[PDB]
Design a protein around this ligand. Structure first.
Ligand SMILES: O=c1ccn([C@H]2C[C@H](O)[C@@H](COP(=O)(O)O)O2)c(=O)[nH]1
Ligand SMILES: [Mg+2]
Ligand SMILES: [Mg+2]
Lengths: 130, 138
């Protein structure tokens, strides 16, 4: 099965948006777009969390189905976060894997003995060599 | 390999945090916490993008290596966004798959001046309510 990062590549190929094979410095127009899309989805997430909190404050017993709007906006936020990494030519699964390695290993600690923080610059260097 | 959503399940299991198997209405304290985590990482991404744009406005030609902080913050944002879905007991991949299908269906639509893909006539949204009902029973 394809990963959510590979899904963004398929979407950008389908709509003709830049999706370079390896890490590539962006034009400012790209960064501005990614900023706009991230701001929009984080505001929608916030709006749906606020709605759930207001309904709970009024004593509403939320059902699982009540979480669908928030789940949709969280997925949209995932989508535009993956989408930023994809348009930068950066394999999001490789960067996530390194952030997860650090976070998960830190949870074996405070930090454990041979603890090594995330080295995303090292991931970007390896991605440049395909 | 495990998916990134399954990685958050593994992380929450390693720190003893709440991780229901199926969609579970959360306590208000949980919602406020996840909102706080989202805002912290969103602000870091936003600041880093503005930082790169200011360097470009100064005439700097950025390199790929200059992108590593931004890639780090975007991955941090993924981590807390997957984390929110996992603490709600919601399979992020099942929801993402439905969202993704309805985004592929936009391909024939027009484009905004800034590059945003817009929806063609007759487009229909993802049915996330149906994903949630799927996850809740099974
Ligand atoms: O250029 C685009 C336009 C839309 N989306 C995705 C992000 C969300 O999943 C959803 C938001 O689209 P709107 O509902 O705001 O039109 O589509 C992108 O990734 N890139
Ligand atoms: Mg949205
Ligand atoms: Mg961060």
């Amino acid at each position: 099965p394809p990963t959510n990062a590979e899904r963004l590549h398929e979407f950008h190929r389908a709509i003709g948006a830049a999706t370079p094979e390896r890490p590539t410095p962006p034009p400012p127009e790209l960064l501005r777009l990614r900023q706009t899309l991230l701001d929009a989805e984080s505001a929608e997430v916030r709006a749906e969390i606020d709605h759930l909190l207001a309904r709970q404050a009024a004593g509403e017993a939320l059902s699982a189905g009540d979480l669908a709007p928030l789940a949709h906006e969280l997925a949209d936020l995932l989508y535009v976060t993956y989408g930023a990494l994809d348009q930068l030519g950066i394999d999001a699964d490789a960067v996530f894997a390194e952030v997860h390695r650090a976070n998960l290993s830190k949870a074996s600690g405070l930090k454990p003995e041979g603890w090594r923080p995330a080295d995303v610059r090292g991931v970007i260097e390896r991605l440049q060599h395909a």
